[PDB]
Amino acid sequence: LKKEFELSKLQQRLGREVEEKIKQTHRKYLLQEQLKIIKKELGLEKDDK
Amino acid sequence: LKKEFELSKLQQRLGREVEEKIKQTHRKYLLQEQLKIIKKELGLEKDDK
Amino acid sequence: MVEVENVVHEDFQVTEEVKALTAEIVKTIRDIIALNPLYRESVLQMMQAGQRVVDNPIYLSDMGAALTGAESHELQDVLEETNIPKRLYKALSLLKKEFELSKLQQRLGREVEEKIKQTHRKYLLQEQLKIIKKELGLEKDDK
Amino acid sequence: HLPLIAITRNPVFPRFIKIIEVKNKKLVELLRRKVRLAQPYVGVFLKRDDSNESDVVESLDEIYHTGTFAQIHEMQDLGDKLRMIVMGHRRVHISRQL
């Protein structure tokens, strides 16, 4: 049972790691996107013909 | 009901007046808040163009 | 070092309608902790204005003004004020000043996310259009 | 008759429990000098704009005249060697901090 258990707990750590990496990806993408919208709507209100 | 309405009215009006005097704070302060937000989620040295 | 408790705290004898601004301060604090949750909201339920347990109102106003994120200097400025309505006015001002930024950030987040949804949802529609014109009609628009 | 405390970026709002964890070990000397008193206490003051620790030990004007004395509860020192607890209990406006 423990022989199965070691792999399971390892898989659990691996799964949370891969998923949290996806979250750290997209959460930071939301932050950068917010950064852009403030640079576009409020900051750089120029850049046009 | 009249006394409560006069109290609620004077409180809402005095608070609306304080709120109007706070809206006098310029929108630049808001743009600075978003600016600090841009820097809080950006970081790094100026290794830009 | 010499020190003295020169804690001035004048208040009107008639204390019935004087706590109504406090009511607005706690309403703004309830709106700040509901729309911008910082700390748990159970503490606001522990220390209410209706319990008559506020033996030290100055302390209650300071604890309510402490949730504001205004810079320390502003706190010193609130202490410089001697009159009681001036500090109440400043505490409310600090709260609203934070409140506008909070509301901007929240509106922006929901707006930007909905833009992402309108992005991908229109892509789902385009995918359905393709798929429904994938195994239905086979256009011969080639050489 | 104690040296001024090194707040070191730690706001202590009045009547709001707070924790202070300075990295410096010179305040620990002060923590050892107040264990002999029967009623120990500590004061909390505020720093002015553009914080700078070297002027606090050189000059005494950076800190504001206002102070908030209160009593210490208990030390823990989980990570650092200076884990003091602060509170806004007794407000005061010193005439001259000098």
Short mmCIF file of C-alpha atoms in Angstrom, two decimals:
data_model
loop_
_atom_site.label_atom_id
_atom_site.label_comp_id
_atom_site.label_asym_id
_atom_site.label_seq_id
_atom_site.Cartn_x
_atom_site.Cartn_y
_atom_site.Cartn_z
CA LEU A 1 0.00 0.00 0.00
CA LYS A 2 2.78 2.45 0.87
CA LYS A 3 4.54 1.50 -2.38
CA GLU A 4 1.47 2.75 -4.20
CA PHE A 5 1.20 5.69 -1.75
CA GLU A 6 4.64 7.15 -2.47
CA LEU A 7 3.89 7.45 -6.16
CA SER A 8 0.43 8.88 -5.45
CA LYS A 9 1.75 11.64 -3.17
CA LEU A 10 4.49 12.36 -5.71
CA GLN A 11 1.83 12.64 -8.42
CA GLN A 12 -0.20 14.93 -6.19
CA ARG A 13 2.76 17.25 -5.72
CA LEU A 14 3.49 17.10 -9.47
CA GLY A 15 -0.13 17.87 -10.35
CA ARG A 16 -0.39 20.87 -8.06
CA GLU A 17 2.94 22.09 -9.43
CA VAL A 18 1.88 21.88 -13.08
CA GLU A 19 -1.50 23.46 -12.31
CA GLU A 20 -0.05 26.23 -10.16
CA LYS A 21 2.44 26.96 -12.91
CA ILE A 22 -0.52 27.42 -15.26
CA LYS A 23 -2.08 29.74 -12.69
CA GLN A 24 1.15 31.70 -12.20
CA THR A 25 1.22 32.01 -15.99
CA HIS A 26 -2.30 33.31 -16.41
CA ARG A 27 -2.57 35.40 -13.25
CA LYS A 28 0.52 37.32 -14.30
CA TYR A 29 -1.00 37.60 -17.75
CA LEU A 30 -4.00 39.29 -16.19
CA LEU A 31 -1.63 41.65 -14.39
CA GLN A 32 0.26 42.50 -17.58
CA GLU A 33 -3.01 42.94 -19.40
CA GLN A 34 -4.18 45.38 -16.71
CA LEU A 35 -0.83 47.16 -17.15
CA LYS A 36 -1.45 47.45 -20.89
CA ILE A 37 -5.00 48.76 -20.53
CA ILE A 38 -3.72 51.49 -18.19
CA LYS A 39 -0.92 52.32 -20.63
CA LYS A 40 -3.46 52.51 -23.49
CA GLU A 41 -6.61 54.06 -21.99
CA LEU A 42 -4.79 56.39 -19.58
CA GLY A 43 -1.08 56.51 -20.36
CA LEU A 44 -0.21 56.49 -24.06
CA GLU A 45 -3.41 58.13 -25.37
CA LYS A 46 -1.55 59.07 -28.61
CA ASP A 47 -0.01 56.74 -31.29
CA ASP A 48 -2.22 57.39 -34.28
CA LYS A 49 -2.28 58.82 -37.76
CA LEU B 1 -40.28 59.57 10.12
CA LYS B 2 -39.80 63.30 9.47
CA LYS B 3 -37.01 63.53 12.06
CA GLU B 4 -35.30 60.44 10.67
CA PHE B 5 -35.62 61.75 7.11
CA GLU B 6 -34.17 65.12 8.12
CA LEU B 7 -31.28 63.42 9.93
CA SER B 8 -30.61 61.00 7.05
CA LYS B 9 -30.97 63.89 4.60
CA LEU B 10 -28.53 66.15 6.42
CA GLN B 11 -26.08 63.26 6.81
CA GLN B 12 -26.33 62.25 3.15
CA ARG B 13 -26.02 65.88 2.06
CA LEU B 14 -23.07 66.73 4.31
CA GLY B 15 -21.39 63.52 3.18
CA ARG B 16 -22.21 64.25 -0.45
CA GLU B 17 -20.60 67.65 0.03
CA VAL B 18 -17.47 66.11 1.57
CA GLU B 19 -17.48 63.60 -1.31
CA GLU B 20 -17.76 66.42 -3.85
CA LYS B 21 -14.83 68.19 -2.19
CA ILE B 22 -12.90 64.91 -2.46
CA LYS B 23 -13.81 64.52 -6.13
CA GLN B 24 -11.96 67.85 -6.58
CA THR B 25 -8.80 65.76 -6.15
CA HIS B 26 -7.50 65.52 -9.66
CA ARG B 27 -7.83 62.50 -11.92
CA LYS B 28 -4.02 62.60 -12.21
CA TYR B 29 -3.93 61.09 -8.71
CA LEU B 30 -5.96 58.17 -10.08
CA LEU B 31 -3.61 57.88 -13.04
CA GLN B 32 -0.70 57.88 -10.55
CA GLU B 33 -2.38 55.07 -8.62
CA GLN B 34 -2.59 53.03 -11.79
CA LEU B 35 1.03 54.06 -12.46
CA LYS B 36 2.15 52.57 -9.16
CA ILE B 37 0.11 49.51 -10.11
CA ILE B 38 2.02 49.31 -13.43
CA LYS B 39 5.28 49.37 -11.50
CA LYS B 40 4.11 47.00 -8.77
CA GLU B 41 3.45 44.18 -11.30
CA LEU B 42 6.34 45.06 -13.68
CA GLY B 43 9.56 45.50 -11.76
CA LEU B 44 13.00 45.00 -13.30
CA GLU B 45 15.58 47.56 -14.38
CA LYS B 46 15.03 49.96 -17.25
CA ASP B 47 16.51 47.57 -19.83
CA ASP B 48 14.00 48.77 -22.39
CA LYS B 49 14.39 50.88 -25.48
CA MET C 1 11.90 62.12 28.43
CA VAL C 2 9.15 64.46 29.64
CA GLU C 3 5.64 63.64 28.41
CA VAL C 4 2.07 64.55 29.34
CA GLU C 5 -1.35 63.13 28.36
CA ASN C 6 -2.72 66.27 26.66
CA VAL C 7 -5.41 64.18 24.91
CA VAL C 8 -8.02 66.86 24.11
CA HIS C 9 -11.43 65.40 23.17
CA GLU C 10 -14.28 67.92 23.33
CA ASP C 11 -17.75 66.63 22.39
CA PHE C 12 -21.23 68.15 22.51
CA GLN C 13 -23.34 67.37 25.58
CA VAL C 14 -26.28 66.33 23.38
CA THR C 15 -25.02 62.94 22.17
CA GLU C 16 -27.93 61.61 20.09
CA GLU C 17 -27.41 62.92 16.52
CA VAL C 18 -23.61 63.27 16.89
CA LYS C 19 -23.03 59.56 16.24
CA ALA C 20 -24.78 59.70 12.85
CA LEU C 21 -21.60 60.65 11.06
CA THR C 22 -20.02 57.65 12.81
CA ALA C 23 -22.87 55.65 11.23
CA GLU C 24 -21.72 56.91 7.84
CA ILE C 25 -18.10 56.07 8.70
CA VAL C 26 -19.07 52.48 9.49
CA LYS C 27 -21.22 52.38 6.35
CA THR C 28 -18.21 53.42 4.28
CA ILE C 29 -16.06 50.89 6.15
CA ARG C 30 -18.67 48.22 5.44
CA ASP C 31 -18.60 49.18 1.78
CA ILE C 32 -14.79 49.18 1.74
CA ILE C 33 -14.54 45.75 3.38
CA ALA C 34 -17.37 44.33 1.23
CA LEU C 35 -16.15 45.66 -2.13
CA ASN C 36 -12.42 45.62 -1.18
CA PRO C 37 -12.06 42.84 1.41
CA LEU C 38 -8.84 43.38 3.35
CA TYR C 39 -9.48 41.77 6.73
CA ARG C 40 -12.26 39.47 7.84
CA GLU C 41 -15.68 41.09 8.21
CA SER C 42 -16.44 39.34 11.52
CA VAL C 43 -14.54 42.05 13.43
CA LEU C 44 -16.98 44.65 12.14
CA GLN C 45 -19.76 42.50 13.59
CA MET C 46 -17.91 42.27 16.92
CA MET C 47 -17.54 46.05 17.40
CA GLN C 48 -20.85 47.66 16.35
CA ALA C 49 -22.24 51.14 17.03
CA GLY C 50 -25.62 49.72 18.23
CA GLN C 51 -24.20 47.78 21.20
CA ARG C 52 -23.41 50.96 23.26
CA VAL C 53 -20.07 49.28 24.18
CA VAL C 54 -18.04 52.12 22.57
CA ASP C 55 -16.74 53.52 25.86
CA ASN C 56 -13.94 55.32 23.96
CA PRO C 57 -15.33 56.81 20.71
CA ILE C 58 -11.96 58.39 19.76
CA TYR C 59 -10.52 54.87 19.76
CA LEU C 60 -13.41 53.57 17.66
CA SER C 61 -12.90 56.31 15.08
CA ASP C 62 -9.18 55.59 14.93
CA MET C 63 -9.72 51.84 14.54
CA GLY C 64 -12.19 52.53 11.74
CA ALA C 65 -9.81 54.96 10.03
CA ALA C 66 -7.01 52.35 10.32
CA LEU C 67 -8.49 50.19 7.54
CA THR C 68 -7.70 53.00 5.07
CA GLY C 69 -4.56 52.45 2.99
CA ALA C 70 -3.54 56.14 3.05
CA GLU C 71 0.15 56.81 3.70
CA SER C 72 1.37 57.22 7.29
CA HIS C 73 1.85 60.99 6.77
CA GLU C 74 -1.94 61.26 6.33
CA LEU C 75 -2.36 59.55 9.72
CA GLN C 76 -0.08 62.14 11.28
CA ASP C 77 -2.14 64.81 9.53
CA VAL C 78 -5.32 63.38 11.04
CA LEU C 79 -3.68 63.56 14.45
CA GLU C 80 -2.69 67.20 13.84
CA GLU C 81 -6.39 68.03 13.51
CA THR C 82 -7.86 69.07 16.86
CA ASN C 83 -11.60 69.35 16.18
CA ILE C 84 -13.60 66.10 16.11
CA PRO C 85 -15.56 66.74 12.85
CA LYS C 86 -12.34 67.64 11.03
CA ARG C 87 -10.79 64.27 11.81
CA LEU C 88 -14.07 62.53 10.94
CA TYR C 89 -14.09 64.45 7.64
CA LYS C 90 -10.48 63.45 6.97
CA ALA C 91 -11.11 59.79 7.85
CA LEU C 92 -14.05 59.67 5.45
CA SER C 93 -11.96 61.45 2.84
CA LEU C 94 -9.22 58.86 3.21
CA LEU C 95 -11.80 56.10 2.82
CA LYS C 96 -13.37 57.59 -0.34
CA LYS C 97 -9.95 58.35 -1.80
CA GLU C 98 -9.04 54.68 -1.51
CA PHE C 99 -12.56 53.71 -2.62
CA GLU C 100 -12.30 55.35 -6.02
CA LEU C 101 -9.09 53.48 -6.86
CA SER C 102 -10.59 50.23 -5.63
CA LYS C 103 -13.68 50.72 -7.77
CA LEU C 104 -11.52 51.53 -10.78
CA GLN C 105 -9.46 48.36 -10.35
CA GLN C 106 -12.54 46.19 -9.86
CA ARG C 107 -14.41 47.63 -12.85
CA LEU C 108 -11.28 47.26 -14.96
CA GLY C 109 -10.82 43.64 -13.97
CA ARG C 110 -14.38 42.60 -14.76
CA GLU C 111 -14.29 44.64 -17.98
CA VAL C 112 -10.99 43.24 -19.22
CA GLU C 113 -12.06 39.71 -18.38
CA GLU C 114 -15.36 40.16 -20.22
CA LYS C 115 -13.35 41.37 -23.19
CA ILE C 116 -11.45 38.07 -23.03
CA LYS C 117 -14.78 36.25 -22.89
CA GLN C 118 -16.14 38.13 -25.90
CA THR C 119 -12.86 37.19 -27.63
CA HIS C 120 -13.10 33.51 -27.00
CA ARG C 121 -16.89 33.30 -27.27
CA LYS C 122 -16.77 34.76 -30.77
CA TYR C 123 -14.04 32.26 -31.50
CA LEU C 124 -16.40 29.50 -30.32
CA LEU C 125 -19.01 30.82 -32.74
CA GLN C 126 -16.46 30.87 -35.55
CA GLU C 127 -15.45 27.31 -34.67
CA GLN C 128 -19.08 26.18 -34.81
CA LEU C 129 -19.48 27.93 -38.16
CA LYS C 130 -16.44 26.15 -39.60
CA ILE C 131 -17.41 22.72 -38.20
CA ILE C 132 -20.98 23.10 -39.47
CA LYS C 133 -19.57 24.05 -42.92
CA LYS C 134 -16.81 21.40 -42.68
CA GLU C 135 -18.79 18.18 -43.22
CA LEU C 136 -21.81 19.82 -44.92
CA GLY C 137 -20.49 21.65 -48.02
CA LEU C 138 -17.02 21.04 -49.58
CA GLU C 139 -16.11 24.15 -51.60
CA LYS C 140 -13.98 23.50 -54.70
CA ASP C 141 -12.13 26.85 -54.57
CA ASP C 142 -8.73 25.61 -55.67
CA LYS C 143 -6.84 25.13 -58.92
CA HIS D 1 15.12 57.83 29.51
CA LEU D 2 15.44 55.33 26.66
CA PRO D 3 16.78 55.71 23.10
CA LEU D 4 14.26 56.24 20.32
CA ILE D 5 12.96 53.05 18.69
CA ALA D 6 13.77 52.11 15.09
CA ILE D 7 10.26 51.76 13.60
CA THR D 8 11.84 50.59 10.31
CA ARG D 9 8.81 50.64 7.95
CA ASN D 10 6.19 49.41 10.40
CA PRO D 11 3.02 51.53 10.75
CA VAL D 12 1.25 51.13 14.08
CA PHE D 13 -2.21 52.60 13.61
CA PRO D 14 -3.81 53.70 16.94
CA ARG D 15 -5.87 50.92 18.61
CA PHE D 16 -4.90 48.31 16.02
CA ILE D 17 -2.68 45.45 17.26
CA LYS D 18 0.60 45.31 15.33
CA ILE D 19 3.88 43.37 15.22
CA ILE D 20 7.38 44.82 14.71
CA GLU D 21 10.33 42.77 13.39
CA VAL D 22 13.36 45.03 12.92
CA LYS D 23 16.38 43.35 11.30
CA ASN D 24 18.89 45.30 13.42
CA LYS D 25 20.09 43.86 16.75
CA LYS D 26 20.69 47.15 18.61
CA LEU D 27 17.03 47.30 19.69
CA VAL D 28 17.50 43.85 21.24
CA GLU D 29 19.97 45.52 23.60
CA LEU D 30 17.09 47.78 24.59
CA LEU D 31 14.87 44.73 24.96
CA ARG D 32 17.37 43.33 27.45
CA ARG D 33 17.64 46.63 29.35
CA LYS D 34 13.87 46.76 30.12
CA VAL D 35 13.47 43.23 31.54
CA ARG D 36 14.57 44.42 35.00
CA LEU D 37 11.70 46.92 35.30
CA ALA D 38 8.61 45.73 37.16
CA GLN D 39 6.17 47.37 34.69
CA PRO D 40 7.80 47.13 31.25
CA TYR D 41 6.62 49.30 28.40
CA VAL D 42 7.59 50.48 24.94
CA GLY D 43 6.81 53.54 22.90
CA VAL D 44 5.84 53.85 19.27
CA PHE D 45 6.56 56.98 17.30
CA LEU D 46 6.27 57.73 13.60
CA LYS D 47 8.94 58.52 11.04
CA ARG D 48 8.75 61.39 8.59
CA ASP D 49 8.89 61.19 4.78
CA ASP D 50 11.93 59.67 3.03
CA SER D 51 12.81 57.19 5.76
CA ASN D 52 16.48 56.89 6.74
CA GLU D 53 17.82 54.85 9.67
CA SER D 54 21.24 56.58 9.88
CA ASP D 55 19.71 59.93 10.74
CA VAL D 56 17.64 58.39 13.55
CA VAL D 57 20.85 57.47 15.39
CA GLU D 58 22.66 60.69 14.34
CA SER D 59 19.77 63.15 14.81
CA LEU D 60 16.48 62.97 16.71
CA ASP D 61 14.38 65.17 14.35
CA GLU D 62 13.26 62.52 11.79
CA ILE D 63 10.79 61.06 14.27
CA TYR D 64 7.61 63.04 14.80
CA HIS D 65 6.89 64.69 18.14
CA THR D 66 3.83 62.47 18.61
CA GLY D 67 4.28 59.18 20.44
CA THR D 68 2.09 56.26 21.49
CA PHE D 69 3.26 54.47 24.65
CA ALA D 70 1.87 51.01 25.34
CA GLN D 71 2.79 47.79 27.14
CA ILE D 72 4.59 44.81 25.65
CA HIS D 73 2.87 41.41 25.85
CA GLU D 74 5.42 38.70 25.04
CA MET D 75 8.31 37.87 22.73
CA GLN D 76 8.34 34.91 20.34
CA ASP D 77 11.34 35.39 18.00
CA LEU D 78 10.38 32.68 15.54
CA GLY D 79 12.56 33.81 12.62
CA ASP D 80 14.27 36.99 13.77
CA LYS D 81 15.81 37.78 17.16
CA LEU D 82 13.63 40.94 17.55
CA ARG D 83 9.88 40.08 17.45
CA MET D 84 8.23 42.73 19.62
CA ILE D 85 4.48 43.41 19.80
CA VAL D 86 3.19 46.99 19.58
CA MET D 87 -0.09 48.70 20.29
CA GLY D 88 -1.56 52.17 20.13
CA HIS D 89 -2.68 52.55 23.77
CA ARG D 90 -1.60 55.95 25.21
CA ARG D 91 -1.32 58.76 22.66
CA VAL D 92 0.91 61.72 23.46
CA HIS D 93 2.24 64.88 21.78
CA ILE D 94 5.65 65.66 23.21
CA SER D 95 6.39 69.39 23.29
CA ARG D 96 9.99 68.79 22.15
CA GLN D 97 11.25 65.31 21.36
CA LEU D 98 14.80 66.69 21.61
#
